[PDB]
């Protein structure tokens, strides 16, 4: 019965009270459909929140914070009810408890509260949770607790609009740089996903990340044995290289391109796609970065992915080679045309997506404009792969820019 537990949870008999709070925790935890609504409806929230402050009996503190965590793990109305019961300041107090399982359940409850949205996040931030949370980053703390701490940090960084206060982000960044020195896969994955979220906001936070000196620790994770770490690190470093050429070169100076042969040939199509997206952002930069790409001998592999890769990887590879054509040297475009580029490039002129067609058209046009001297040789190659057929068929494309560009480059 759901009334007996709330009736016994207020009993002055400490044994029966702790048993009842434990039974409430069990009802909220073990099952797939916890009866959170009826439990709140019976008035258990104030009882649990006032059990939170009984320093005399830490087991009761633990069980109460546990039940509150599992209540806050549900809908936004239930997390907001936990918050309305003024449990956040009590969790912030429990952070300093000498009993580490109580202090860990407090962190878990705070993480569930922060995960609801920017409002609860900014409430918990304004009450000063960042520094007491980061004080747990030490070898003494067991790795389960540190995993929960890294998860709370991820929840702190996950929402971009409205973003957490830049002061809090500045306080968080060194903690992430400390956590990235870890070996545990879950901690590393969470740290790198938090870095990925932070880099999403724009070039300001990209520069903030770079100033932390964490890129030297993040880049080598592209070759980690665990593929989850690999995809997380690839996302983060791609976000970074979407920034200015100096930021991209900061990433490149850690020798990131060394880690990409194993990515362009990875068995998972997703890692291929993300690697070619990274390299496409690299080719859009200065000609020094294009030459750095060519030096690592990555051009043949991105050509091969353009040829025989999955659809999204093919789109990213078309983007890579087209940015290369736009911001590349005549000799480098010749290097491209030399490595069987145009035959597999022209087979994507038939796809339904209009952006890929626009991109391949502009790429071919700009290589022909870049090499008008010896264009007579290049144009005959298109006939071999049946590319001229698809170009004169594109002349009938619906949107105007594609057809007018086909007409414009028929020369």
């Amino acid at each position: 019965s759901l009334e007996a537990i709330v009736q016994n949870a207020s009993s002055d008999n400490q044994g029966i009270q702790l048993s009842a709070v434990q039974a409430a925790r069990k009802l909220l935890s073990s099952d797939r459909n916890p009866p959170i609504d009826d439990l709140i409806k019976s008035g258990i929230l104030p009882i649990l929140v006032h059990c939170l402050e009984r320093d005399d009996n830490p087991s009761l503190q633990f069980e109460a914070a546990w039940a509150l965590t599992n209540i806050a793990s549900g809908t936004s109305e239930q997390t907001q009810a936990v918050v309305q019961s003024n449990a956040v300041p009590l969790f912030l107090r429990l952070l300093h408890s000498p009993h580490q399982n109580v202090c860990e359940q407090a962190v878990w409850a705070l993480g569930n509260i922060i995960g609801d949205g920017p409002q609860c996040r900014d409430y918990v931030i304004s009450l000063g949770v960042v520094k007491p949370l980061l004080s747990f980053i030490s070898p003494s703390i067991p790795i389960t607790f540190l995993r929960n701490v890294t998860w709370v940090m991820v929840n702190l960084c996950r929402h971009k609009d409205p973003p957490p206060p830049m002061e809090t982000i500045q306080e968080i960044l060194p903690a992430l740089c400390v956590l990235i020195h870890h070996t545990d896969v879950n901690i590393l994955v969470d740290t790198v996903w938090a870095l990925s979220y932070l880099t999403d906001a724009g070039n300001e936070q990209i520069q903030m990340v770079i100033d932390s000196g964490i890129v030297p620790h993040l880049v080598p994770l592209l070759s980690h044995q665990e593929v989850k770490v690999q995809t997380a690190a690839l996302r983060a470093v791609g976000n970074i290289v979407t920034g200015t050429d100096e930021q991209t070169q900061v990433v490149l100076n850690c020798d990131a391109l060394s880690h990409f042969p194993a990515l362009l040939t990875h068995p998972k199509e997703k890692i291929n796609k993300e690697a070619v997206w990274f390299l496409s952002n690299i080719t859009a930069g200065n000609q020094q970065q294009v030459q750095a790409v060519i030096d690592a001998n990555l051009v043949p592999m991105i050509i091969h992915l353009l040829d025989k890769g999955d659809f999204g990887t093919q789109k990213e590879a078309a983007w890579a080679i087209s940015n290369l054509t736009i911001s590349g040297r005549k000799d480098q475009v010749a290097y491209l045309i030399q490595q069987n580029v145009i035959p597999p490039f022209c087979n994507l002129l038939t796809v339904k997506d209009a952006q890929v067609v626009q991109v391949v058209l502009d790429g071919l046009s700009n290589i022909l404009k870049m090499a008008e001297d010896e264009a007579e040789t290049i144009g005959n190659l298109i006939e071999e792969c049946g590319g001229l057929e698809k170009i004169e068929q594109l002349q009938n494309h619906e949107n105007e820019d594609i057809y007018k560009l086909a007409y414009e480059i028929i020369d």
Binding site: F62, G111, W151, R158
Partner: peptide, 11 residues
Amino acid sequence: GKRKKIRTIAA
């Protein structure tokens, strides 16, 4: 990963 987590077992 997940934004909210439910704790089932303690040790």
